[PDB]
């Protein structure tokens, strides 16, 4: 049911429900992308994938992994059109923290700053909701690794392990019993949890090429994407 | 009619105003936060429950004190809370350094809620469904105030919104009368707070803020459960 | 469906004011106030919307706002929309006292905010002010002046006022009790007690749920008297003593 | 038909009719056929007036020395761009001290009409301008449309009953690149007179003719100036 | 088909909200008036005052200068703006061009401002009108009117409100040179034409006579009764 | 029910049909494809002809934005020249401030924000025209990036735009790009472009060709027909 | 200079339970007298004053802008203003003009609104508050200014001794100069009552 | 309509049968047609072509001269009472019909029989003057100050 | 249906522009004539009530010393553009030292004819008739709110312009002098008017290079009456 302009605007329904925002919740679901964010003891591993319909697809540009800072990366979901616009913004707001405040941002406030203007995108319907979804990571002093996620409803969010998106609902359900455990996680254990959670969602387990797996650990604090050489090495390690 | 259009606010044929009235219906569907004005201090007990066990409450904080002597809690929806937080963080600190002194919280509720009035009352495109429970300590006598999206500031010794707003307000209307003992007022305020609350109560299921006359102190789930349930 | 469209800018269609008819409906919603003629002073009354005793009552004067040392006002309407008008006229009265170093005459004062409220009811599609606030004070020319603000821009200022729509029962009482030259401000105060105990829906004149604010002319202090509930309680027993005296006749 | 209101909102089929609605205003104007040879160019238009005593309003006018133009449709946007054409022609004539070729000049006109056809609250502009000019490589004839698409042509025609002009143009426009001015002008009116109904004039004051060349400055030919062009004419058959 | 009216004209060539606005002048406060070679008079009444309320607050007709006075009708909300808006311009015509305010200048300002007042979507139109009352320099009379479309027109006498043409028919006999030869008969003729307008009870009746360039004074219930006595005596001796 | 009118506002299904209207408006345009070889990037445009309709060789969809960059565009010609000037002004900012060759990856991101911002505001409209971005440099190399009206930034070895983008990209997978010279890559497009898009629908037409690469020393200029023996390479195998 | 143009000297010396502030009555252009009734110290609220020395315009303009923002705060909350609040109000108002600041010598002397505790402070024309507990020193001749006030001003002063202390202080420093003179007014306020006196000085 | 029927659409088409019935085919003579109803716009312009194009009149609010005249003729044939004056009846009312001035004197005679008086008695004169002081004869919005 | 005003029609064309032509019908009827010796024009005042002053509203105004004018349709919108061009003719007499030509007066108003801006929110439906004597002698110009400019030897506007233009072109004389234009003006006048002719019913406007200005003078209207 709808009355007035509430179809085209974000005002709340007589039941206290938003319209243009509730349609953007599944706008990420139409993107067809599953990014699960899980954090171990000293490390956090992000697992993603991509589709290659045509043989002309370039791995470089179509790669969904985006690195905001040397020590802070991210990943997106849903429509990739709006996601790139938020990527360069996170680079700009992190640089303001570098310029003004002089040091690296904890990224906990970066989620707040991005979601604050993401709330402005949710404020006026003339500037479009910008239905791109953002998932963040980073390193804070004596906090170990961190994991953060922001959808385009405009709040800052992060926890131990949090995943939301198209198929991420089936991933978090299996990981509740899987992640606990809840003890010190080796690098091979975190990668094993990336395929096993994907095996419950998908169970295709195709070539490690198409899937993109990042990691954030404290040895060198800089964020690094896993090389295709080591991904196939850990893939044959968990499956004997 | 209609007839009032917008800017700053919408229209009603009979009373109040339609449109944002529907956002007011979402205010009752927000997170319930109890509050207590007891003796020389103000106590604020909120309710926070995560969707799944994969979440840790140590990250997201529902209590974000603007000043050392003034805390706050929110009754309502999401980041529109955090929007007025940074606002009041800018708003209250400007007036703090204008005269260089905090000045009693009565003028703080005057100025800080003045722009919050305009911000909530004036057209924001989409409405704002976040209300607040205002607290502080002024000249030895603290204050507990309750704002709303409509911009009507109240004064309560014990108040509740969100859930129990129908039950808890009538509860505190009967059992609580005038001013009573400090910790004894917290007792009956939590008894009605657990009325509609879930049967499972843990350190992470709620949070209790307290405004001392010596300045605000934000508690943690550790000391929240170690106090009492039943905190008194 | 010519008048069913949301406009708020241009007028209606037979010459009647479009929104002003609906603006007076909001004035008659939960409004309370009264006024009467008094020599060497003036008196006003207020009513607390919430009778719940758990309130702190730390707002002190709430339905009565003091915009000047020699002048005050009584808000009837939405409190959120009126708080913008409070500081507005207060700053306009302050910038006038700043400019001429002389107290702002209430002639142009009231008409200033009435034209300020008129601009919001004229153009820009802006929401009209649904709050009607009174005016009281003293000037060097006409002395005691009483005014009432209206949304349309034409003030309802008179020597008497009706707030709200429920006060229409007191209007026939004020016209029948209309008198000139006798004060004794308590003669009208005891009459205002009869207004609340009879014409108003709430009987017995609950003290904590009402307020009485009076202004007595004093040179040059012009003391504004916030009572508030102190001797109103004995005025309750005073009006009931009149009711106990009236039943002795029959 | 509600999807044709807003120019910003795309239709269900993607075709915005606000341009096609202005195409009607371009096609509701007078019949004008422009053409060019290698040596010189000859552009022709038509005049119509309210009454008999009212002088027929002229269309072809002069802007740049080497740029002649015609016009059809709304005169409001015509003289707005005409004065805008003056400012654009005097840009390089002042700073660069040289005239602007039609090639790069109309690229600014096409961008000037892009904003009113894009943003909300704006309307397209019906324009019947037929632009001519001579750069180092010879003459160029463009076209003006609300779609803001200009095409370099030897001959093109817009306005009313101009579909019959293109048919007479196709075989003639290839053969008109050779002959000189005089016989080309009377062959130009031999086109429009077949488009227009054959039972009426076609007087001296109801027709517009102009000629521009590399070494010949553009001169407006109207009224008595048309008389040398209308003498020695072959009457239309029956 | 029919979009009613916002700004752009209706298919018939006219407007609606304008025509709709003139009916407010019909339901507004009625007014009358006359002019003469030297002295001029006017009237409004339609006060609906019960005397139990402040009489100075309901006062409407004012004067920019002693030479030119303002007489309006309808609601006083927008008219209070017409007062202040004309007071600033008449003070500018005071300031610039120090000569006494000419009626052509001041009326065009209000008219040019009353046209942009009805223009934007934007500034709200006027639903009321007004009629300028005063005298030209050297004792010559001047009276004009205003229109919601921002135009001005001059009349021989002021007749508006209910029965504009009916009073104008009575103003045909007012065209005689006898009115106004003496200010005693003119005021008696004002109460005559006003007797057919509304109640004409004598209470709310308010008339101010301006003789030559001297500022007008509202007639108190003293001379008004004497001018009503000679009007009743002229009616009794007419048989 | 009126949900597809506003481009800025979403629809109950989670997307906007105005983007589908702009995407299918590109489908109505004539076939223009592109492919990148080892040392260069090949561009092409098929220009339709009805009657004449005008002087041959003008108002072509081939545009030159930058020294090392080129344009193959389709759709409405005014918005094609508009998007050409938007990129021309963008290439003018990078050349003004810096003065060296703008990388094609970051150039596509700058144009991405432009086209994306046009889809955000309901005041302006999403452009229903598409273009082909490609470039070559000695340090950079040959890249070909495809941009869509929705604002998605990405690139493939080859792309297809026109009435049918399926049958046009069908033979590109069997076409040998690297090993065969760029001059042979031009004829590989010219042969099938005559094969497909049959002359029954459009009687007369003309095929525009443009190439930039090492043989041109990084400069972009339209290559004529008879040059580089392309006229004979066009009709050789295209008669089948 | 702008200061010495209109002249004037403000000296606020605090007693034991009371606070006194005084300023000369002389108002004139340079060496020429105009009128002695021009008011310098103006009342602010109740039981609190402020001194001003400098251009009469900057004396009236600031006092008008100060009373402006003061009544704005006092009408929102009926309670009075604290000396620390007024000290920050004048310092912020004078700092709003960076390169254009008004030339004056504001001296705030008044009781606390809550209790009888007196407090005084002095502010620079650029908005710099100068914190002094009780006594301030000014004048013309150097030996009388700092030499006498040490043995004159007591740690605890009564209104009697405090009035005679600033008396000879304004007699020796002012009347020594030829153009200085024309009387001095003294304002001594306490919680019980407000006392206002004037100093006897020659008219030459 | 009462209540839900055949129906919200077709009932307009069987009312359209009335619309064509009055068009009409073929209207010639009379059978006079005099219509009384709120709005005339229900008839289509095609109906006006056969008729009836003569004129339509509106009944204005009767003024004090009409109130007294209507009340006089009704009391002309049937004799009235002398103690009841017609001046205070027409003066105390503004814009009222001739029927409304009638029964305000009936509501006085209404309560009069409760006192058991068939005769004309001065006890009702005050109770009728009380109905003049009772006012309430007219009301209509307004409410505004113009 | 669903007329989009300045936004075009589904057919299509402008609509309110045509409705602005209807706004000429409601105005007073003015019939202009251009002759070799001068330009004569007449329009009915159409006095509604005897309270109306005859010279209060006039349809003939003077733009420049040598330029006459005749307004149409609305008044306030006319006098707006009237006084406007009067300032435009003043600035043209400064920089160029010469009075503004009647020609350039058209295109000056024609640029602002339809702005679709704050003026021209709603456009003005005022037609303008431009008379005067330029360097080419007496001329008479006609324009409409849409900005059309066509030089007419004799032009009529207002209500009766339909029936006025009928008998106009028939009895019009291009090569004759003002002597016949005198009686030729009252012909169409007495036709369209249904009431007796007096100085207050209509007004005459005659501008000549040698005799001017003139404009017109008092009590020359009743002279034409008795000359019948």
Swiss-Prot record, chain B:
GO BP terms, alphabetized: proteasome-mediated ubiquitin-dependent protein catabolic process; response to virus
Modified residues annotated as Phosphotyrosine in this record: 4, 22, 74, 119
Modified residues (N6-acetyllysine): 68, 169
SMART domains in UniProt: Proteasome_A_N (SM00948)
Matching SUPFAM superfamilies: N-terminal nucleophile aminohydrolases (Ntn hydrolases)
Recorded superkingdom: Eukaryota
Subcellular location, record wording: Cytoplasm; Nucleus
Sequence positions bearing Phosphoserine: 5, 12, 14
Induction summary: Down-regulated by antioxidants BO-653 and probucol. Down-regulated in response to enterovirus 71 (EV71) infection (at protein level).
Description of post-translational modifications: Phosphorylated on tyrosine residues; which may be important for nuclear import.
Sorted UniProt keywords: Acetylation, Cytoplasm, Nucleus, Phosphoprotein, Proteasome
GO cellular component: cytoplasm; cytosol; extracellular exosome; extracellular region; ficolin-1-rich granule lumen; nucleoplasm; nucleus; P-body
Entry-linked NCBIfam families: PRK03996.1
Family the UniProt entry places it in: Belongs to the peptidase T1A family.
Subunit structure, as described in the record: The 26S proteasome consists of a 20S proteasome core and two 19S regulatory subunits. The 20S proteasome core is a barrel-shaped complex made of 28 subunits that are arranged in four stacked rings. The two outer rings are each formed by seven alpha subunits, and the two inner rings are formed by seven beta subunits. The proteolytic activity is exerted by three beta-subunits PSMB5, PSMB6 and PSMB7.
Name this protein carries in UniProt: Proteasome subunit alpha type-2
Organism: Homo sapiens (Human)
Taxonomic path: Eukaryota, Metazoa, Chordata, Craniata, Vertebrata
Protein's gene: PSMA2
UniProtKB/Swiss-Prot annotation, chain C:
Entry keyword annotation includes Nuclease: no
InterPro entries: Ntn_hydrolases_N, Proteasome_alpha, Proteasome_alpha-type, Proteasome_asu_N, Proteasome_bsu_CS, Proteasome_sua/b
Gene3D superfamilies linked to this entry: Glutamine Phosphoribosylpyrophosphate, subunit 1, domain 1
Record keyword Ubl conjugation present: no
Classification via Pfam families: Proteasome, Proteasome_A_N
Gene Ontology, cellular component aspect: cytoplasm; cytosol; extracellular exosome; intracellular membrane-bounded organelle; nucleoplasm; nucleus; P-body; proteasome complex
Residue list for modification N6-acetyllysine: 126, 175
Domain of life: Eukaryota
BP GO annotations: proteasome-mediated ubiquitin-dependent protein catabolic process
Induction annotation: Down-regulated by antioxidants BO-653 and probucol.
Locations listed in the record: Cytoplasm; Nucleus
PROSITE patterns recorded: PROTEASOME_ALPHA_1 (PS00388), PROTEASOME_ALPHA_2 (PS51475)
CDD domains, alphabetized: proteasome_alpha_type_4 (cd03752)
Annotated keywords: Acetylation, Cytoplasm, Host-virus interaction, Nucleus, Phosphoprotein, Proteasome
Phosphoserine modifications at: 12, 74, 172
Protein family (similarity comment): Belongs to the peptidase T1A family.
Protein's job: Component of the 20S core proteasome complex involved in the proteolytic degradation of most intracellular proteins. This complex plays numerous essential roles within the cell by associating with different regulatory particles. Associated with two 19S regulatory particles, forms the 26S proteasome and thus participates in the ATP-dependent degradation of ubiquitinated proteins.
Name of the protein this chain belongs to: Proteasome subunit alpha type-4
Gene source species: Homo sapiens (Human)
UniProtKB/Swiss-Prot annotation, chain D:
Localization (cell): Cytoplasm; Nucleus
Crosslink (Glycyl lysine isopeptide (Lys-Gly) (interchain with G-Cter in ubiquitin)) position: 112, 205
One of the GO BP terms on file: proteasome-mediated ubiquitin-dependent protein catabolic process
One annotated Gene Ontology cellular component of this protein: proteasome core complex, alpha-subunit complex
The entry's keywords: Acetylation, Cytoplasm, Glycoprotein, Immunity, Isopeptide bond, Nucleus, Phosphoprotein, Proteasome, Ubl conjugation
In-chain residues carrying the UniProt-annotated modification Phosphoserine: 107, 174
Induction line: Induced in breast cancer tissue (at protein level). Up-regulated in liver tumor tissues.
Listed InterPro entries: Ntn_hydrolases_N, Proteasome_alpha, Proteasome_alpha-type, Proteasome_alpha1, Proteasome_asu_N, Proteasome_sua/b
Glycan-linked positions: 107
Molecular-function annotations in GO: lipopolysaccharide binding
Subunit structure, interactors included: The 26S proteasome consists of a 20S proteasome core and two 19S regulatory subunits. The 20S proteasome core is a barrel-shaped complex made of 28 subunits that are arranged in four stacked rings. The two outer rings are each formed by seven alpha subunits, and the two inner rings are formed by seven beta subunits. The proteolytic activity is exerted by three beta-subunits PSMB5, PSMB6 and PSMB7. Interacts with NOTCH3. Interacts with ZFAND1.
Annotated protein name in UniProt: Proteasome subunit alpha type-1
Lineage, uppermost ranks: Eukaryota, Metazoa, Chordata, Craniata, Vertebrata
Gene (UniProt): PSMA1
Swiss-Prot record, chain G:
InterPro entries: Ntn_hydrolases_N, Proteasome_beta_3, Proteasome_bsu_CS, Proteasome_sua/b, Proteasome_suB-type
SUPFAM superfamilies: N-terminal nucleophile aminohydrolases (Ntn hydrolases) (SSF56235)
Main location: cytoplasm
Keyword Metal-binding: no
N6-acetyllysine: modified positions: 76
Record GO cellular component, one term: proteasome core complex
Induction: Up-regulated in asthenozoospermic sperm.
Keyword tags: Acetylation, Cytoplasm, Host-virus interaction, Nucleus, Proteasome
PROSITE patterns the record matches: PROTEASOME_BETA_1 (PS00854), PROTEASOME_BETA_2 (PS51476)
Modified positions (N-acetylserine) in chain numbering: 1
Gene Ontology terms: biological process: proteasome-mediated ubiquitin-dependent protein catabolic process
Subcellular location, record wording: Cytoplasm; Nucleus
Cited Pfam families: Proteasome
Function: Non-catalytic component of the 20S core proteasome complex involved in the proteolytic degradation of most intracellular proteins. This complex plays numerous essential roles within the cell by associating with different regulatory particles. Associated with two 19S regulatory particles, forms the 26S proteasome and thus participates in the ATP-dependent degradation of ubiquitinated proteins.
Similarity comment text for this entry: Belongs to the peptidase T1B family.
Protein name: Proteasome subunit beta type-3
Lineage: Eukaryota, Metazoa, Chordata, Craniata, Vertebrata
Gene that this sequence comes from: PSMB3
